[PDB]
Amino acid sequence: AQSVPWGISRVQAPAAHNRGLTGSGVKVAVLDTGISTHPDLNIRGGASFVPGEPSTQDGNGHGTHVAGTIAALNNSIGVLGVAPSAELYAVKVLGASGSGSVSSIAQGLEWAGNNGMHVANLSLGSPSPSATLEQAVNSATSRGVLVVAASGNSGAGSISYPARYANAMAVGATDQNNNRASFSQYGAGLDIVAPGVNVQSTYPGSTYASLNGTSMATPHVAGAAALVKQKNPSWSNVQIRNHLKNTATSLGSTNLYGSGLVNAEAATR
Ligand SMILES: [Ca+2]
Ligand SMILES: [Ca+2]
Numbered sequence: 001a002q003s004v005p006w007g008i009s010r011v012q013a014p015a016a017h018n019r020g021l022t023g024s025g026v027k028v029a030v031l032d033t034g035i036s037t038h039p040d041l042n043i044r045g046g047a048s049f050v051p052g053e054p055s056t057q058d059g060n061g062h063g064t065h066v067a068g069t070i071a072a073l074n075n076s077i078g079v080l081g082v083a084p085s086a087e088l089y090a091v092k093v094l095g096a097s098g099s100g101s102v103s104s105i106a107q108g109l110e111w112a113g114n115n116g117m118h119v120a121n122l123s124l125g126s127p128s129p130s131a132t133l134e135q136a137v138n139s140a141t142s143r144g145v146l147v148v149a150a151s152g153n154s155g156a157g158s159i160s161y162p163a164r165y166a167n168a169m170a171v172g173a174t175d176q177n178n179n180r181a182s183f184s185q186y187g188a189g190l191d192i193v194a195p196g197v198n199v200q201s202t203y204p205g206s207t208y209a210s211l212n213g214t215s216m217a218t219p220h221v222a223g224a225a226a227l228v229k230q231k232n233p234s235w236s237n238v239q240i241r242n243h244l245k246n247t248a249t250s251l252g253s254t255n256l257y258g259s260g261l262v263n264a265e266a267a268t269r
Pocket of ligand 2: 165166167169170191
């Protein structure tokens, strides 16, 4: 029995799936704590940039969780991703403890840019800016990667790095009411929002678990981008990012919500 988590249908991925759009041929890199082998996931490759954890398997559960929001397989078990046919690559830039260095994160993006990744998912952040990080962001961007990052969970009216950088697509979190979740950082650089409360997904030990955060919202956007990329194979990172924003559902102030809630139905139209 397969269930469709609420944010998947909130963003209207099924509407897109019903038109032949599943993210097929789109390469998506998850820069996180790894992705564990799971019966509802198809991991195509990856690398680890965490000294001391040479494997890409997830010792934390955070990346496995994020990954399933993007691409949990559409079959008869578990859950369902926004882009269930996306090619998923596990890029480990965060250790088991759930933290990493800017160095490891910048190496992951470098890797993404060098390996022709179309979308990079960075459900991570820091309140502090990093010149290293920023350059990596910009580099992956000129290599044609769309970088999608979490705004953070401090609840403050200013967003984290790298989401704050012009070249990153900053994602905030909404609740089932289509209100901004209290922890969701907002303000300048915020581009769009997505479901980030009680998000059910894939978890290590072949199970499913629900989490809260902008980390959970980000992957709905990364997925949404793969759907559009499949529909418009000639579009660049910028064209996708703008189409997403242009087709989002307004939810109120752009200070709080940026463009509004991502809408994969409106976007693959
Ligand atoms: Ca499934
Ligand atoms: Ca931004």
